[PDB]
Amino acid sequence: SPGIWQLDCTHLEGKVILVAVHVASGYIEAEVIPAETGQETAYFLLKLAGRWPVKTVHTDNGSNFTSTTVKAACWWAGIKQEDGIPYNPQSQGVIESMNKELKKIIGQVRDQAEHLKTAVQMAVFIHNHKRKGYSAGERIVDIIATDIQ
Amino acid sequence: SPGIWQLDCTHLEGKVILVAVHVASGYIEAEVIPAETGQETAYFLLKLAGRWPVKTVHTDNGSNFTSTTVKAACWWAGIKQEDGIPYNPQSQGVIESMNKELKKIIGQVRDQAEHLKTAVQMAVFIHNHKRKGYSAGERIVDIIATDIQ
Ligand SMILES: Cc1cc(CO)nn1-c1ccccc1CN
Ligand SMILES: Cc1cc(CO)nn1-c1ccccc1CN
């Protein structure tokens, strides 16, 4: 469970926001992309896995699960590619709630930012620092550190 | 020291590679950008600080130190902006050695990847996972976790 991530794709301003959630902590990384292609998803996973110890990724949909390019990136980066079927039904609600929260924060910034990508990274910052009391950023580091030891 | 990062800008294929190094661990994040502007550097720092607890950044040059946009990003993200003057002269050598190493890895993968940005992220992955025996990725998490506790 320290190495389990879930992909999530949401839309805003006619643009695509690709999100990776560290399931145990709620910590996220995100990027704005023109469209969710296998290539874009593969590149995003490469970046993620160079930065955190990504053991398993639950893909956000069947197209990214099927994608040879995504499979190739998972092979390259040593990631077990899995489906994202909500066997525990609460998983749908959790992801939906996060997308709502993220969009709310995006709305709260951007009087401040010209470009959506800046607003999305501001939202990532606020989400990961928010105390709920530890933050998601604190939880992910503690979870992974405990695993190392 | 858990929160201290150093910026580093290096060049390859007529392109700019912007690197942030976590000084205590040797862990890095990097991106390819068309040119090192204040705007690009500011955005890079925003991304970094949303992902790791960035307390202090030693800027890579005087232009980024001076930049109002970089100063604004540091304000936004709660980062202390500092110079990168090598008061300890070994710091020059360390950064140069890292740039050499990074370019070497890029060369080793360059044929697997069409685009330089992909090769750079492969290099980030290899660098952060390399056992020296802990990896830089392991060291950064342990350093920050110990600071939290
Ligand atoms: C790791 C990764 C990211 C992307 C997409 O940018 N492709 N791969 C990949 C995967 C396997 C082989 C070659 C490549 C490079 N094309
Ligand atoms: C945090 C950050 C990154 C960048 C550059 O993309 N600017 N800022 C910034 C900083 C302060 C205010 C508004 C903005 C938004 N322009």
Side-chain angles (χ1 to χ4, degrees):
Chain A
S1 209
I4 313 297
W5 294 74
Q6 168 77 239
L7 284 176
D8 163 48
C9 187
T10 193
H11 299 77
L12 198 67
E13 299 180 13
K15 291 197 168 61
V16 174
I17 302 168
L18 187 56
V19 183
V21 190
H22 183 256
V23 175
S25 68
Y27 171 97
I28 68 171
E29 306 221 2
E31 70 172 12
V32 172
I33 54 179
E36 193 184 38
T37 64
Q39 183 74 7
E40 292 287 350
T41 302
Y43 181 70
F44 181 74
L45 289 171
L46 171 60
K47 289 189 290 178
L48 186 70
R51 285 155 180 75
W52 294 100
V54 179
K55 176 191 185 204
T56 301
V57 65
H58 291 276
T59 49
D60 56 324
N61 58 54
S63 293
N64 275 336
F65 185 79
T66 302
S67 171
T68 309
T69 304
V70 175
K71 287 184 196 299
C74 287
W75 166 78
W76 198 96
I79 301 168
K80 187 178 190 150
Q81 190 211 214
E82 291 182 4
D83 66 61
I85 295 166
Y87 290 103
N88 181 347
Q90 291 184 344
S91 300
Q92 296 156 87
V94 167
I95 296 301
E96 288 160 10
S97 288
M98 178 181 71
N99 288 340
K100 277 190 75 209
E101 179 208 352
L102 284 180
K103 288 176 180 178
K104 181 176 139 177
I105 301 165
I106 291 164
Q108 291 172 342
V109 307
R110 112 187 259 52
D111 57 310
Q112 304 179 48
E114 168 167 16
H115 301 101
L116 179 62
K117 67 173 178 178
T118 305
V120 170
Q121 303 307 325
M122 287 177 166
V124 169
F125 183 106
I126 289 164
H127 173 87
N128 288 340
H129 283 87
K130 185 176 176 195
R131 302 194 165 278
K132 277 178 79 194
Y134 295 94
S135 67
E138 286 168 342
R139 294 191 290 269
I140 187 169
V141 169
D142 181 56
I143 287 164
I144 296 168
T146 307
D147 183 62
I148 292 164
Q149 276 60 249
Chain B
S1 93
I4 300 179
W5 294 74
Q6 168 78 239
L7 284 176
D8 163 48
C9 187
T10 193
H11 299 77
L12 198 67
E13 299 180 13
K15 291 197 168 61
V16 174
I17 303 168
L18 187 56
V19 183
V21 190
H22 182 256
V23 175
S25 68
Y27 171 97
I28 68 171
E29 306 221 2
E31 70 172 12
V32 172
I33 54 179
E36 193 184 38
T37 64
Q39 182 73 7
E40 292 287 349
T41 302
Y43 181 70
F44 181 74
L45 289 171
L46 171 59
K47 289 189 290 178
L48 186 70
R51 285 155 180 75
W52 294 100
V54 179
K55 177 191 186 203
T56 301
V57 166
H58 291 276
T59 50
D60 56 323
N61 58 54
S63 292
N64 275 337
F65 185 78
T66 302
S67 171
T68 306
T69 304
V70 175
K71 287 184 195 299
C74 287
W75 166 78
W76 198 96
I79 301 168
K80 291 195 195 175
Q81 189 211 32
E82 291 182 4
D83 65 61
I85 295 166
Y87 290 103
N88 181 347
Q90 290 194 131
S91 301
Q92 296 156 87
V94 166
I95 296 301
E96 279 301 307
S97 288
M98 178 181 72
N99 288 340
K100 184 163 147 183
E101 178 226 32
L102 283 180
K103 289 176 180 178
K104 182 171 190 75
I105 301 165
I106 291 164
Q108 291 171 344
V109 304
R110 193 69 189 80
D111 78 307
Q112 298 178 47
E114 169 166 17
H115 301 101
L116 179 62
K117 67 174 178 178
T118 305
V120 170
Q121 302 307 325
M122 287 176 167
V124 169
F125 183 106
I126 289 164
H127 173 87
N128 288 339
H129 287 263
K130 185 175 177 194
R131 302 194 165 279
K132 324 284 277 195
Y134 294 94
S135 67
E138 286 168 342
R139 293 192 290 269
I140 187 169
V141 169
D142 181 56
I143 287 164
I144 296 168
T146 307
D147 183 62
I148 292 164
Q149 309 330 311

